[PDB]
Amino acid sequence: INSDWNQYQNWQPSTGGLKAYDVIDQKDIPDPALREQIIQQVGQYKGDLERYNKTLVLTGDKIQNLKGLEKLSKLQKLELRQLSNVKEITPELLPESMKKDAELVMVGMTGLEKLNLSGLNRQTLVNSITHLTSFDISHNSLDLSEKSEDRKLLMTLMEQVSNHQKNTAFENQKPKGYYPQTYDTKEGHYDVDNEHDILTDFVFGTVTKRNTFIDEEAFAIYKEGAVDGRQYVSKDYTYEAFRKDYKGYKVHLTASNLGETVTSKVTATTDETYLVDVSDGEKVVHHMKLNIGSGAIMMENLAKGAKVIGTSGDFEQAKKIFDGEKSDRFFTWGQTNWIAFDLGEINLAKEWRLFNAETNTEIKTDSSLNVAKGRLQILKDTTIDLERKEYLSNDENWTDVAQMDDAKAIFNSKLSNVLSRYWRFCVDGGASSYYPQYTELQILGQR
Amino acid sequence: QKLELRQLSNVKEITPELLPESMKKDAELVMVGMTGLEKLNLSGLNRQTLDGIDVNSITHLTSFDISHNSLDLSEKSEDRKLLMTLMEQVSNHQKITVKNTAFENQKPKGYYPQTYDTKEGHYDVDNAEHDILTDFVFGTVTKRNTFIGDEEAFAIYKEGAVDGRQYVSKDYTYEAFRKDYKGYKVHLTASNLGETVTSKVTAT
Amino acid sequence: GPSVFLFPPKPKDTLMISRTPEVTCVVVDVSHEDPEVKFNWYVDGVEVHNAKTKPREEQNSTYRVVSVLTVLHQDWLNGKEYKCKVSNKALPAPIEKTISKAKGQPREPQVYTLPPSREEMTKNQVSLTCLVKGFYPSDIAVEWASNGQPENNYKTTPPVLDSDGSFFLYSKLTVDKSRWQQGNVFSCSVMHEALHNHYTQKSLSLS
Amino acid sequence: GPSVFLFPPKPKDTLMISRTPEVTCVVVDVSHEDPEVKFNWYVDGVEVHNAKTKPREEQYNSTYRVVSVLTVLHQDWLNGKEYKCKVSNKALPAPIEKTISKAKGQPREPQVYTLPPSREEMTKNQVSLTCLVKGFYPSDIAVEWASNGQPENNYKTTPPVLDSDGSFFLYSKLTVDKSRWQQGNVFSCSVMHEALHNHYTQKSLSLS
Ligand SMILES: [Ca+2]
């Protein structure tokens, strides 16, 4: 029921109203005009009041008092529109939901003389309230700093009060903290100074609901803030409470060799450039570049989308080494295999990278299925016009340019500035009797 | 809350489906004199230690699986030395394979170090901000008090292995292991005996 | 109470590098009252933790629970035992079901394609036949093709034990007579562990 | 406690005048202690007393099996009459009742085609004569081989297979020495099914 009614609301029901029972009387809502409107909007039964959890729009000059409105404990939004004869709003009149961020709109409240919203954790907030004599917006979660809209609304509330008399409580605010929506640094830089922390340096700080940016020292200055020499922040409100903890924030670093790591630390030993993707845990909140020293030029995977021209195994399967993914593997019924491929043009190859069997992102693959030993190769005849299987199969036409001797999950090594169109990667042996697999092969350099 | 297996000489198998659910939430497990036990499977019970398990009495062992636990099998850990006995017991009867000596995929839990070293810190008058927590009061330990200072030390810890077999779980992030130092406050009494609460000090 | 069925991998999946074979374990007639179903998987009596349990499926007031263990081609083809163990509150003792590949000297299939009978040629659709005989074990897969494209209007018999201890079957592709008479080539693909690369093809065209 | 199994007649026996079809009723796991097993047979709910009960057969220590065999009339079976077997015993709470009848549905006549060996098989000492039977319903069928009026007995037939049109098909594979094929002997594939005239056709197969 309760789970169905939760979806269906778009046992008696937890939320909304009673199940399709005494009628709403003056003992609930005294004012006949208010009683009428609430009945039309929430229901005609006593048990509807506690359950109704949507919007209530109160209108007209007929409403004199708002008694009974507190019974709408779950109300998600209250709009007070042109209520010209309403003279008092106290927190005991508003519903409990106001303390948990229910929305509160009021326009044209020309008769209101007392506006008490104290102790409702209001996170945000006046030109129509021209008959104001007292107000209390203390013990809320407001940001009344210099450059805040809420301060400007407070200033109007005070000007309204000042028109009738010298009743203006706005102290003891505990404004809530949020993560900043964007960070400024799009290009960070460090010297080659031989540890820096990317989170503390570039992705840091807390904001209010009005986007006022705050360290501990800045929070201290914020607490000292005041309107008419009256400190508005609650004294007993710790920085530890306000600040965001940046918990489970990860920093994804892609180097010039396109190698990936997850760390906020970088020890600036050598010249380098990283792409930085910072993650809260579910999404990336910031991207930027980070040059260490003079920097380094971003390499490209030259092997990406390379044409297979021969292989000791399945031709169609060999094509999966040069897609973008590690969601499928190449192997053969044996411990040895080779794939020859064509980058289409001659380019400068500076390093290479093999993603081994266990890098598979589709089936949890044990490292015993990894390639233990292999060789990357280039064709000898630099400019031969291929018009083939017997040729590519024959080891004499190939010069090694790299060796693999470790069953690493990912294997990267450097190449002697290799210029070659045609390549071959041979698997020489596996990490066990199980036939070795691998998922992706990169040839890394400048185009 | 606690299971003691004492001189159960005719018990030949312990599987995780035989033990109670509570074993996955740190119920105590003692076993002494298990002379007939040939298969010891404690896999997937988040065991944080091999305390209780009298490894010297398990003389009929042929297979064991203590994988997918929360053990610290680093070099200078007691749990590694207990594992070494479990393997020696197996090796007495049959060739040591991976199929009969599983100890991989450990996700050891992190704890706060009991003591920090620095008893007297020093900064120059560099007009820079320094952080007392980052500089002096930092790091995480295992249940066997193996100190990991930072991300880089955790990396070295993950690369650790027994007989060239990496025991830590590959999918186990530093973010999970490390302690967050949440709600840690730094109380500073100056020479003027003035007190502040902050981890920051600008060395003016 | 709950029953258990343990199905082997599709023979093509064990034999083809492009494919990933799976042993599947199904628990039927699970009660609403005691719904927790624990699976344990064993390979030659050695527990494996890489299985993947799919959530319950109302098949009233009775659920079905499937668990799928990926297998290594070599493990299956070397005839290793896959044990599935099921636990439940409405079971007195756990249920244990085991499957392996049939042990025995493998024997290479002989593939013969047979054209339609003269008598069938009077009809608008004719039967292209593929005989596969003398193979062991009975795990096999048969497909049809023509001009590189898959032909899909066919049915294959289950393997049948022959008098010599080996197996045989027939696959029967049905085509419009027009396509047969126009002289198109059809292929019968057979996949079996005793073939080179677990694969051969026999052709069949008008004669 | 005792179980009951009720088996239908062999399809050839229902279709062929030379044969007498039988419904068979088996009671398994009968105790030594209470051994008397009474059978009652019904044909469309009408009791028949012509059944023939064979004596008990010890399967394992102190556990017996009891079979009762009722002869059926070809017409009754083919007209889809229900055969009920009722078993009584002391170790039963109530008697057990099992019923079988013929598979219902619009009959479809089998098409029989004989196929000669493949050229490729002719390299072997024995070759495969094939008989295709397709488009038949229901799946009850019988296939035999013959040559020169004598039965050929070295053959295997596939179970019926459901085709894409809702009918069934199968293959029978007679194996003969190549010598006999090449010498030009005629082989016959006999098919027996309720939708054939006289429940019978024969197709021949010899070297061209
Ligand atoms: Ca790939």
Side-chain angles (χ1 to χ4, degrees), chain A residues 2-6 9-10 13-18 20-22 24-26 28-35 37-39 41-43 47-61 63-80 82-86 88-91 93-106 108-113 116-145 147-148 150-151 153-157 162-165 167-173 175-216 218-223 225-227 229-239 241-387 389 391-404 406-447, chain B residues 1-94 96-98 100-118 120-204, chain C residues 1-31 35-57 60-62 64-88 90-207, chain D residues 1-46 48-89 91-118 120-208:
Chain A
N2 299 37
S3 52
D4 308 49
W5 169 246
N6 228 58
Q9 73 183 343
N10 310 134
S14 328
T15 39
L18 275 176
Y21 289 98
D22 297 42
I24 294 167
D25 57 309
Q26 30 72 252
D28 312 315
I29 296 147
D31 193 278
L34 176 68
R35 188 164 61 245
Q37 300 190 22
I38 286 173
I39 288 168
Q41 294 191 66
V42 319
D48 288 316
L49 293 168
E50 51 194 323
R51 294 183 167 69
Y52 185 77
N53 61 341
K54 291 171 283 173
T55 306
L56 181 83
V57 180
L58 300 180
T59 60
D61 56 346
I63 303 183
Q64 306 292 349
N65 76 106
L66 289 178
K67 178 62 187 49
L69 191 70
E70 65 275 355
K71 286 166 179 62
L72 286 94
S73 45
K74 296 193 168 163
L75 185 74
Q76 284 297 123
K77 178 171 189 183
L78 177 71
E79 303 187 21
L80 305 184
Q82 259 104 359
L83 292 189
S84 53
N85 282 40
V86 171
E88 199 145 46
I89 294 172
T90 80
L93 295 190
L94 302 191
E96 286 166 71
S97 43
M98 288 298 129
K99 312 206 301 281
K100 305 282 168 188
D101 292 309
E103 285 209 68
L104 179 69
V105 172
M106 39 181 96
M109 303 299 299
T110 60
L112 190 80
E113 20 175 310
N116 185 358
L117 299 181
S118 59
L120 300 178
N121 318 293
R122 308 306 301 167
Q123 301 206 55
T124 189
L125 287 167
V126 291
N127 296 65
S128 57
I129 323 187
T130 53
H131 278 106
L132 198 68
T133 57
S134 56
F135 73 79
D136 179 0
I137 63 170
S138 72
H139 297 107
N140 282 309
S141 310
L142 295 170
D143 172 18
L144 302 175
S145 80
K147 291 285 189 303
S148 175
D150 291 312
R151 169 175 271 207
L153 300 169
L154 171 72
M155 295 319 205
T156 327
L157 282 170
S162 75
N163 282 348
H164 290 65
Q165 51 191 225
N167 61 0
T168 55
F170 53 71
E171 295 91 359
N172 295 120
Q173 305 297 346
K176 277 290 171 67
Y178 297 103
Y179 285 104
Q181 303 307 298
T182 59
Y183 302 73
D184 297 54
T185 309
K186 288 299 161 62
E187 202 159 69
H189 178 288
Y190 297 137
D191 297 310
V192 188
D193 46 59
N194 294 260
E195 256 194 311
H196 304 255
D197 190 289
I198 286 166
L199 286 176
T200 65
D201 286 3
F202 304 118
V203 188
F204 68 106
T206 306
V207 295
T208 62
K209 186 87 182 182
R210 301 304 195 140
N211 202 15
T212 310
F213 186 73
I214 284 82
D215 51 8
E216 288 102 316
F219 191 60
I221 315 165
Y222 177 77
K223 289 176 66 75
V227 171
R230 303 154 65 180
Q231 289 172 292
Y232 47 71
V233 182
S234 59
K235 323 272 281 187
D236 66 350
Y237 185 41
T238 174
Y239 177 64
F242 170 72
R243 76 167 214 277
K244 302 300 279 183
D245 54 354
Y246 278 94
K247 195 203 202 300
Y249 267 60
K250 304 167 76 67
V251 176
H252 296 38
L253 295 184
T254 319
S256 324
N257 62 334
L258 299 196
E260 279 143 61
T261 58
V262 172
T263 179
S264 61
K265 299 292 202 294
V266 281
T267 302
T269 70
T270 178
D271 291 64
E272 249 290 303
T273 302
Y274 301 80
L275 292 180
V276 184
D277 293 72
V278 179
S279 177
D280 72 17
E282 273 198 298
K283 69 173 208 303
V284 173
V285 294
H286 188 63
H287 180 82
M288 51 171 225
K289 186 174 288 181
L290 177 73
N291 298 264
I292 302 185
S294 59
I297 193 61
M298 226 59 94
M299 289 177 198
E300 305 169 54
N301 183 11
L302 301 173
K304 175 56 194 292
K307 185 134 77 81
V308 178
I309 61 168
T311 176
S312 75
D314 176 33
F315 162 79
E316 281 297 302
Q317 206 71 13
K319 298 203 275 186
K320 295 184 143 43
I321 293 301
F322 307 109
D323 59 14
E325 271 123 330
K326 303 159 232 304
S327 54
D328 206 346
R329 84 262 98 121
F330 175 82
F331 72 100
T332 65
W333 305 111
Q335 227 80 236
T336 65
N337 65 59
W338 62 266
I339 297 172
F341 52 104
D342 175 4
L343 305 199
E345 42 167 323
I346 304 199
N347 292 128
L348 187 71
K350 291 165 74 199
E351 327 185 349
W352 75 298
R353 182 170 298 113
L354 179 149
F355 301 82
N356 220 321
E358 66 178 286
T359 63
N360 192 355
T361 66
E362 213 56 29
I363 294 92
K364 179 132 292 174
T365 303
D366 183 287
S367 60
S368 61
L369 270 55
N370 280 7
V371 176
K373 320 175 303 182
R375 296 162 291 164
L376 180 69
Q377 295 173 345
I378 64 168
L379 201 67
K380 267 173 183 162
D381 193 339
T382 325
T383 57
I384 188 65
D385 214 12
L386 299 187
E387 265 73 69
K389 202 55 142 61
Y391 182 77
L392 296 174
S393 302
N394 166 239
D395 292 51
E396 288 297 290
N397 299 309
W398 298 104
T399 309
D400 297 0
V401 298
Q403 278 240 0
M404 162 173 218
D406 198 4
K408 273 213 202 76
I410 304 177
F411 193 101
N412 174 245
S413 77
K414 290 175 148 184
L415 304 181
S416 306
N417 297 260
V418 178
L419 305 102
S420 184
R421 167 166 167 171
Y422 304 79
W423 298 69
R424 183 173 78 162
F425 180 71
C426 310
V427 168
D428 289 345
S432 67
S433 56
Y434 289 115
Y435 304 131
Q437 317 179 348
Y438 67 113
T439 60
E440 191 71 5
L441 194 92
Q442 305 190 307
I443 301 294
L444 303 156
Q446 313 300 306
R447 217 208 316 112
Chain B
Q1 284 297 122
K2 177 171 192 180
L3 177 71
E4 301 187 21
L5 305 184
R6 284 168 29 187
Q7 261 76 49
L8 294 188
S9 52
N10 281 42
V11 171
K12 273 155 181 150
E13 263 203 346
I14 295 172
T15 80
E17 324 97 49
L18 294 189
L19 306 189
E21 280 181 70
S22 42
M23 288 298 129
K24 311 202 283 277
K25 324 217 68 169
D26 293 310
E28 284 185 65
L29 179 67
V30 171
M31 38 178 94
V32 178
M34 302 299 299
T35 60
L37 190 79
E38 322 157 357
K39 155 112 96 160
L40 180 66
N41 185 358
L42 298 183
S43 59
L45 299 177
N46 319 73
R47 307 307 302 163
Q48 301 207 53
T49 54
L50 287 170
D51 266 6
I53 304 171
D54 180 12
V55 291
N56 295 296
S57 58
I58 323 187
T59 53
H60 269 230
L61 199 66
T62 57
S63 56
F64 73 79
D65 179 359
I66 62 170
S67 72
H68 297 108
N69 282 309
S70 309
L71 295 171
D72 172 18
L73 301 177
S74 81
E75 203 157 69
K76 286 145 58 198
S77 174
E78 168 82 19
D79 291 313
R80 184 186 197 114
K81 99 147 179 47
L82 299 168
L83 170 73
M84 249 45 180
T85 327
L86 281 171
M87 281 178 95
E88 279 160 42
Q89 301 286 37
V90 164
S91 75
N92 196 35
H93 297 297
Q94 153 185 63
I96 307 161
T97 82
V98 187
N100 63 357
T101 56
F103 54 71
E104 296 91 349
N105 295 120
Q106 305 297 346
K107 298 186 183 188
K109 276 204 55 166
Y111 295 104
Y112 284 104
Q114 301 309 298
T115 304
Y116 303 73
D117 295 358
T118 307
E120 204 167 49
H122 178 288
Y123 298 137
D124 296 311
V125 188
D126 45 60
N127 293 106
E129 203 186 44
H130 305 255
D131 190 289
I132 287 165
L133 287 176
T134 316
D135 286 3
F136 304 118
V137 188
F138 68 77
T140 306
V141 294
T142 62
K143 214 196 200 187
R144 301 304 196 157
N145 207 103
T146 312
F147 185 74
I148 284 82
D150 50 10
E151 214 149 11
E152 219 218 317
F154 191 60
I156 315 309
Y157 177 77
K158 293 188 74 171
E159 291 302 285
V162 171
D163 285 12
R165 304 156 64 180
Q166 292 181 345
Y167 46 71
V168 182
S169 188
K170 55 180 287 181
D171 67 349
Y172 185 41
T173 174
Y174 177 64
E175 221 80 55
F177 171 71
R178 76 172 170 84
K179 300 301 274 177
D180 54 354
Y181 281 75
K182 206 188 173 187
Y184 268 59
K185 299 182 293 184
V186 177
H187 299 11
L188 297 181
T189 318
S191 41
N192 54 307
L193 297 198
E195 280 158 352
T196 57
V197 175
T198 179
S199 61
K200 300 292 204 292
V201 280
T202 302
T204 70
Chain C
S3 307
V4 178
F5 299 108
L6 183 65
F7 304 117
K10 297 183 301 190
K12 180 176 176 195
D13 292 350
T14 68
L15 289 174
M16 290 296 109
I17 285 162
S18 62
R19 305 284 292 258
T20 315
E22 293 172 344
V23 169
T24 316
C25 181
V26 186
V27 183
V28 288
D29 297 301
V30 178
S31 58
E36 294 295 303
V37 176
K38 185 180 166 176
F39 293 83
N40 302 258
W41 282 99
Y42 299 78
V43 180
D44 283 352
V46 167
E47 189 157 328
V48 302
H49 318 297
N50 65 303
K52 305 267 277 184
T53 298
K54 309 195 286 200
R56 316 192 220 292
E57 298 160 13
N60 216 331
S61 63
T62 52
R64 186 183 72 167
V65 184
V66 180
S67 175
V68 197
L69 177 70
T70 294
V71 306
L72 299 183
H73 303 73
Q74 296 170 257
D75 282 349
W76 180 258
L77 289 168
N78 292 125
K80 287 198 165 50
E81 296 201 349
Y82 290 77
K83 177 196 303 200
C84 172
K85 188 200 298 187
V86 177
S87 291
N88 199 244
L91 284 173
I95 297 174
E96 285 187 12
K97 300 293 187 81
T98 301
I99 58 161
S100 55
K101 191 180 71 62
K103 40 214 69 66
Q105 183 68 58
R107 296 191 54 201
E108 187 180 71
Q110 316 160 49
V111 180
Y112 305 114
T113 58
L114 309 184
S117 181
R118 295 52 53 197
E119 328 287 305
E120 198 180 27
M121 290 299 310
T122 80
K123 311 222 155 284
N124 284 0
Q125 300 208 307
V126 298
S127 291
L128 282 50
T129 295
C130 179
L131 163 66
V132 189
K133 59 161 286 167
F135 62 91
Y136 192 103
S138 60
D139 300 302
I140 201 166
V142 181
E143 294 176 356
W144 289 82
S146 175
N147 297 300
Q149 300 316 115
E151 286 293 306
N152 280 318
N153 187 4
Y154 65 97
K155 296 293 191 184
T156 309
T157 65
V160 176
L161 189 85
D162 217 314
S163 61
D164 79 358
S166 68
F167 289 81
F168 80 82
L169 56 78
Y170 284 91
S171 188
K172 184 185 76 67
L173 173 71
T174 287
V175 306
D176 303 311
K177 182 177 61 194
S178 44
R179 295 183 56 227
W180 174 246
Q181 291 182 314
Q182 282 167 350
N184 290 267
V185 178
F186 297 80
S187 270
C188 168
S189 310
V190 172
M191 278 156 183
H192 184 281
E193 69 178 70
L195 290 172
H196 184 94
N197 281 329
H198 311 144
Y199 186 97
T200 49
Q201 223 174 24
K202 279 310 182 298
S203 295
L204 180 70
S205 67
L206 182 69
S207 292
Chain D
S3 306
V4 178
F5 299 75
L6 184 64
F7 306 69
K10 292 180 299 200
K12 183 198 176 170
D13 293 350
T14 68
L15 290 174
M16 290 290 98
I17 284 169
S18 62
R19 309 221 52 68
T20 226
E22 295 172 343
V23 169
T24 315
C25 182
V26 185
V27 184
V28 287
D29 296 301
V30 179
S31 58
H32 184 99
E33 324 95 48
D34 38 44
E36 287 304 308
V37 179
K38 188 177 189 311
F39 292 98
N40 301 258
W41 283 98
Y42 300 104
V43 181
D44 280 357
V46 167
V48 303
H49 294 103
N50 64 302
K52 212 173 169 199
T53 297
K54 309 196 295 185
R56 37 192 207 152
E57 293 156 0
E58 220 174 13
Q59 331 174 172
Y60 55 100
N61 269 352
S62 297
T63 318
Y64 297 77
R65 186 184 68 172
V66 183
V67 179
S68 175
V69 196
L70 177 71
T71 299
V72 305
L73 299 186
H74 303 73
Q75 300 175 256
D76 281 349
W77 179 259
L78 285 165
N79 288 298
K81 286 198 164 193
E82 296 204 298
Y83 288 77
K84 176 139 60 74
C85 172
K86 189 179 62 171
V87 177
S88 296
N89 199 46
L92 285 173
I96 297 175
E97 283 182 9
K98 297 261 155 167
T99 301
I100 58 161
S101 59
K102 194 179 70 57
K104 298 149 195 182
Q106 253 295 354
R108 299 281 182 237
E109 188 187 10
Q111 318 210 109
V112 179
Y113 306 114
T114 58
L115 310 183
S118 183
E120 295 190 308
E121 199 179 15
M122 293 301 309
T123 79
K124 312 274 285 170
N125 286 5
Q126 297 208 307
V127 298
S128 290
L129 306 197
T130 299
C131 178
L132 164 65
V133 188
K134 59 171 285 172
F136 62 92
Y137 192 103
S139 61
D140 300 302
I141 200 166
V143 181
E144 297 181 7
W145 289 83
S147 177
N148 299 116
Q150 277 299 306
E152 285 293 301
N153 280 318
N154 188 44
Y155 64 97
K156 296 292 184 178
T157 310
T158 65
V161 176
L162 192 85
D163 218 311
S164 61
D165 78 1
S167 67
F168 287 92
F169 79 81
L170 57 77
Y171 283 92
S172 188
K173 185 182 76 67
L174 174 71
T175 289
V176 303
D177 304 311
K178 182 175 60 195
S179 43
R180 296 177 60 224
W181 175 247
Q182 293 182 128
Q183 282 168 349
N185 290 262
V186 178
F187 298 79
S188 271
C189 169
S190 309
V191 172
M192 277 157 299
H193 184 281
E194 69 174 73
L196 289 170
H197 185 262
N198 282 337
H199 312 142
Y200 189 80
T201 48
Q202 217 161 349
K203 267 34 192 182
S204 297
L205 180 71
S206 66
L207 181 63
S208 179

